[PDB]
Design an enzyme around this catalytic site. Structure first.
Site, PDB file in Angstrom:
ATOM      1  CG  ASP A  44      -1.863   1.173   1.279  1.00  0.00           C
ATOM      2  OD1 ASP A  44      -2.930   1.085   0.629  1.00  0.00           O
ATOM      3  OD2 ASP A  44      -1.501   2.167   1.976  1.00  0.00           O
ATOM      4  CE1 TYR A  84       0.702   5.574   1.966  1.00  0.00           C
ATOM      5  CE2 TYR A  84       0.215   7.843   2.523  1.00  0.00           C
ATOM      6  CZ  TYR A  84      -0.145   6.522   2.492  1.00  0.00           C
ATOM      7  OH  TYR A  84      -1.361   6.164   3.018  1.00  0.00           O
ATOM      8  CE  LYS A 108      -4.022   4.419   0.617  1.00  0.00           C
ATOM      9  NZ  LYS A 108      -2.542   4.284   0.947  1.00  0.00           N
ATOM     10  CG  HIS A 124      -5.039   9.521   0.290  1.00  0.00           C
ATOM     11  ND1 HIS A 124      -3.671   9.568   0.045  1.00  0.00           N
ATOM     12  CD2 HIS A 124      -5.174   9.168   1.591  1.00  0.00           C
ATOM     13  CE1 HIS A 124      -3.019   9.303   1.148  1.00  0.00           C
ATOM     14  NE2 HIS A 124      -3.905   9.055   2.110  1.00  0.00           N
TER      15      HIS A 124
HETATM   16  N1  LIG Z   1      -5.599   5.756   3.750  1.00  0.00           N
HETATM   17  C1  LIG Z   1      -5.114   6.669   4.673  1.00  0.00           C
HETATM   18  O1  LIG Z   1      -5.618   7.792   4.790  1.00  0.00           O
HETATM   19  C2  LIG Z   1      -4.115   6.080   5.554  1.00  0.00           C
HETATM   20  C3  LIG Z   1      -3.850   6.652   6.803  1.00  0.00           C
HETATM   21  C4  LIG Z   1      -2.933   5.938   7.579  1.00  0.00           C
HETATM   22  C5  LIG Z   1      -2.259   4.787   7.161  1.00  0.00           C
HETATM   23  N2  LIG Z   1      -2.501   4.309   5.914  1.00  0.00           N
HETATM   24  C6  LIG Z   1      -1.770   3.142   5.374  1.00  0.00           C
HETATM   25  O2  LIG Z   1      -1.695   2.131   6.384  1.00  0.00           O
HETATM   26  C7  LIG Z   1      -0.363   1.825   6.750  1.00  0.00           C
HETATM   27  C8  LIG Z   1      -0.225   1.321   8.180  1.00  0.00           C
HETATM   28  O3  LIG Z   1      -0.790   2.201   9.172  1.00  0.00           O
HETATM   29  P1  LIG Z   1       0.369   2.993  10.010  1.00  0.00           P
HETATM   30  O4  LIG Z   1       1.514   3.395   9.148  1.00  0.00           O
HETATM   31  O5  LIG Z   1      -0.313   3.950  10.903  1.00  0.00           O
HETATM   32  O6  LIG Z   1       1.027   1.874  10.913  1.00  0.00           O
HETATM   33  P2  LIG Z   1       0.582   0.544  11.772  1.00  0.00           P
HETATM   34  O7  LIG Z   1       0.433  -0.561  10.744  1.00  0.00           O
HETATM   35  O8  LIG Z   1      -0.632   0.880  12.572  1.00  0.00           O
HETATM   36  O9  LIG Z   1       1.903   0.182  12.518  1.00  0.00           O
HETATM   37  C9  LIG Z   1       2.207   1.040  13.654  1.00  0.00           C
HETATM   38  C10 LIG Z   1       3.586   0.695  14.124  1.00  0.00           C
HETATM   39  O10 LIG Z   1       3.640  -0.675  14.539  1.00  0.00           O
HETATM   40  C11 LIG Z   1       4.953  -1.086  14.537  1.00  0.00           C
HETATM   41  N3  LIG Z   1       4.906  -2.506  14.321  1.00  0.00           N
HETATM   42  C12 LIG Z   1       4.706  -3.158  13.106  1.00  0.00           C
HETATM   43  N4  LIG Z   1       4.730  -4.450  13.313  1.00  0.00           N
HETATM   44  C13 LIG Z   1       4.949  -4.691  14.672  1.00  0.00           C
HETATM   45  C14 LIG Z   1       5.104  -5.847  15.448  1.00  0.00           C
HETATM   46  N5  LIG Z   1       5.048  -7.222  15.007  1.00  0.00           N
HETATM   47  N6  LIG Z   1       5.356  -5.666  16.777  1.00  0.00           N
HETATM   48  C15 LIG Z   1       5.427  -4.419  17.270  1.00  0.00           C
HETATM   49  N7  LIG Z   1       5.302  -3.255  16.602  1.00  0.00           N
HETATM   50  C16 LIG Z   1       5.067  -3.462  15.294  1.00  0.00           C
HETATM   51  C17 LIG Z   1       5.641  -0.329  13.425  1.00  0.00           C
HETATM   52  O11 LIG Z   1       6.945   0.150  13.839  1.00  0.00           O
HETATM   53  P3  LIG Z   1       8.284  -0.435  13.110  1.00  0.00           P
HETATM   54  O12 LIG Z   1       8.290   0.213  11.707  1.00  0.00           O
HETATM   55  O13 LIG Z   1       9.387   0.135  14.048  1.00  0.00           O
HETATM   56  O14 LIG Z   1       8.300  -1.958  13.194  1.00  0.00           O
HETATM   57  C18 LIG Z   1       4.684   0.803  13.120  1.00  0.00           C
HETATM   58  O15 LIG Z   1       5.313   2.116  13.119  1.00  0.00           O
HETATM   59  C19 LIG Z   1       0.390   3.109   6.356  1.00  0.00           C
HETATM   60  O16 LIG Z   1       1.842   2.865   6.369  1.00  0.00           O
HETATM   61  C20 LIG Z   1      -0.277   3.462   5.052  1.00  0.00           C
HETATM   62  O17 LIG Z   1       0.256   2.561   4.037  1.00  0.00           O
HETATM   63  C21 LIG Z   1      -3.405   4.945   5.143  1.00  0.00           C
HETATM   64  C1  LIG Z   2      -6.705  15.320   4.869  1.00  0.00           C
HETATM   65  C2  LIG Z   2      -6.138  13.919   4.893  1.00  0.00           C
HETATM   66  C3  LIG Z   2      -6.998  12.838   4.772  1.00  0.00           C
HETATM   67  C4  LIG Z   2      -6.539  11.517   4.774  1.00  0.00           C
HETATM   68  C5  LIG Z   2      -5.163  11.387   4.933  1.00  0.00           C
HETATM   69  N1  LIG Z   2      -4.403  10.236   5.001  1.00  0.00           N
HETATM   70  C6  LIG Z   2      -3.075  10.565   5.160  1.00  0.00           C
HETATM   71  C7  LIG Z   2      -2.066   9.545   5.198  1.00  0.00           C
HETATM   72  O1  LIG Z   2      -2.277   8.611   4.401  1.00  0.00           O
HETATM   73  N2  LIG Z   2      -0.978   9.704   6.006  1.00  0.00           N
HETATM   74  C8  LIG Z   2      -0.949  10.621   7.169  1.00  0.00           C
HETATM   75  C9  LIG Z   2      -1.126   9.750   8.398  1.00  0.00           C
HETATM   76  C10 LIG Z   2       0.057   8.766   8.547  1.00  0.00           C
HETATM   77  C11 LIG Z   2      -0.183   7.922   9.776  1.00  0.00           C
HETATM   78  C12 LIG Z   2       1.020   7.095  10.141  1.00  0.00           C
HETATM   79  O2  LIG Z   2       0.789   6.339  11.356  1.00  0.00           O
HETATM   80  C13 LIG Z   2       0.075   7.852   7.308  1.00  0.00           C
HETATM   81  C14 LIG Z   2       0.014   8.644   6.018  1.00  0.00           C
HETATM   82  C15 LIG Z   2      -2.978  11.966   5.212  1.00  0.00           C
HETATM   83  C16 LIG Z   2      -4.299  12.453   5.070  1.00  0.00           C
HETATM   84  C17 LIG Z   2      -4.775  13.774   5.040  1.00  0.00           C
END
Ligand SMILES: NC(=O)c1ccc[n+]([C@@H]2O[C@H](COP(=O)([O-])OP(=O)(O)OC[C@H]3O[C@@H](n4cnc5c(N)ncnc54)[C@H](OP(=O)(O)O)[C@@H]3O)[C@@H](O)[C@H]2O)c1
Ligand SMILES: Cc1ccc2[nH]c(C(=O)N3CCC(CCO)CC3)cc2c1
Length: 298
Positions: free
Chosen positions: A45, A50, A79, A112
């Site tokens: 993803d 990003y 996205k 997004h």
């Molecule tokens: N669509 C959107 O608007 C949106 C918003 C947020 C996120 N996303 C997508 O979703 C992804 C994931 O969400 P997120 O980045 O917030 O992170 P997350 O998947 O909720 O992970 C949070 C943290 O967990 C740690 N972690 C991972 N595996 C672990 C394990 N086995 N044990 C302990 N800790 C562990 C990681 O640190 P380490 O790296 O140090 O292991 C990471 O920083 C993003 O990277 C992005 O691709 C999309």
């Molecule tokens: C207005 C608006 C809406 C949805 C959005 N989504 C993200 C996004 O995808 N990012 C910001 C949060 C980060 C969380 C990391 O834990 C991961 C990347 C930024 C953003 C901004």
């Protein structure tokens, strides 16, 4: 292990989250996406926002060139950013992502966020654009084979109903990617999505990266929750594996970001154990309406 989408394409149920804050050198995205593929992740993803499509693309291409995986085995998501909602900016924004990643198509292209922003990453300013026209412009991308599937992100039920009820709709969204974890389990939205054959995909499923920008340092640490820790010990896994397993068992596709080699290999163990119905009920009990990300901040 995949889930069949409403357009007949297949999405692997465990995805690799690629966002890292901008202090992390862009070379780490290439290295960790290679390790994630090596470890068995096949859903990756990314997003225009990003600033890593070049390096995530290079990783996928590297592993196809050396015969580790075939293109058809990888499910790559990008996205559409909010500065590009205007219908004419959509196909060009997708072509830009494809140029950057040097891929021929994305398996998935998402709106997004339902917010629109002045065309130009966050100008400082909004912009009324009808998400339903933003959608017909996505739909053409699917017709054109540049996105195998299309979906949305950060939509609630109303905003999904806006597309589903759209006069003359050709393609439903295949998914809605939303923040989803035991402190904010989205059980109503998930029931709605199931009723529409829309897959919910969970981001911040591990409690978020707790980035200073968006996360109050006081707020509860998901992976220290005593329920997920008690289940970790019960199964001889880790709280992060329990959080991921929970989603898989309730029919959610789950993302997991990690930039750490051991944790990247650990996350693929989610397929090695199961939670009992009582376990699931205990995690269900965690719901508290806690948002780690608030788009109103960003
Ligand atoms: N669509 C959107 O608007 C949106 C918003 C947020 C996120 N996303 C997508 O979703 C992804 C994931 O969400 P997120 O980045 O917030 O992170 P997350 O998947 O909720 O992970 C949070 C943290 O967990 C740690 N972690 C991972 N595996 C672990 C394990 N086995 N044990 C302990 N800790 C562990 C990681 O640190 P380490 O790296 O140090 O292991 C990471 O920083 C993003 O990277 C992005 O691709 C999309
Ligand atoms: C207005 C608006 C809406 C949805 C959005 N989504 C993200 C996004 O995808 N990012 C910001 C949060 C980060 C969380 C990391 O834990 C991961 C990347 C930024 C953003 C901004």
């Amino acid at each position: 292990q995949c889930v069949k989408l409403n357009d007949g394409h297949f999405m692997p149920v465990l995805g690799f989250g690629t966002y890292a804050p901008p202090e992390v050198p862009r070379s780490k995205a290439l290295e960790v996406t290679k390790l994630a593929i090596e470890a068995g992740f096949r859903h990756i993803d990314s997003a225009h926002l990003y600033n890593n499509e070049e390096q995530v693309g290079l990783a996928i291409r590297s592993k196809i060139a050396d015969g580790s995986v075939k293109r058809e085995d990888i499910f790559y998501t990008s996205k559409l950013w909010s500065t590009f909602h205007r219908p004419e900016l959509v196909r060009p924004a997708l072509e830009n992502s494809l140029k950057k990643a040097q891929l021929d198509y994305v398996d998935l292209y998402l709106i997004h966020s339902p917010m629109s922003l002045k065309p130009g990453l966050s100008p400082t300013i909004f912009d009324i654009v009808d998400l339903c026209t933003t959608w017909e412009a996505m739909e053409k991308c699917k017709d054109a084979g540049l996105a195998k599937s299309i979906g949305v992100s950060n939509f609630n039920r109303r905003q999904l109903e806006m597309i589903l009820n759209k006069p003359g709709l050709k393609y439903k969204p295949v998914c809605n990617q939303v923040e989803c974890h035991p402190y904010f389990n989205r059980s109503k939205l998930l029931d709605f999505c199931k009723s529409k054959d829309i897959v919910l995909v969970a981001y911040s499923a591990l409690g978020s990266q707790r980035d200073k920008r968006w996360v109050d340092p006081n707020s509860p640490v998901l992976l220290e929750d005593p329920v997920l820790c008690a289940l970790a010990k019960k199964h001889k896994r880790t709280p992060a594996l329990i959080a991921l397993r929970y989603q898989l068992q309730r029919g959610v596709v789950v993302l997991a970001k990690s930039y750490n080699e051991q944790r990247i290999r650990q996350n693929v163990q989610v397929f090695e154990f199961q939670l009992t119905a009582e376990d699931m009920k205990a995690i269900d009990g965690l719901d508290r309406n806690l948002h780690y990300f608030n788009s109103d901040s960003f």
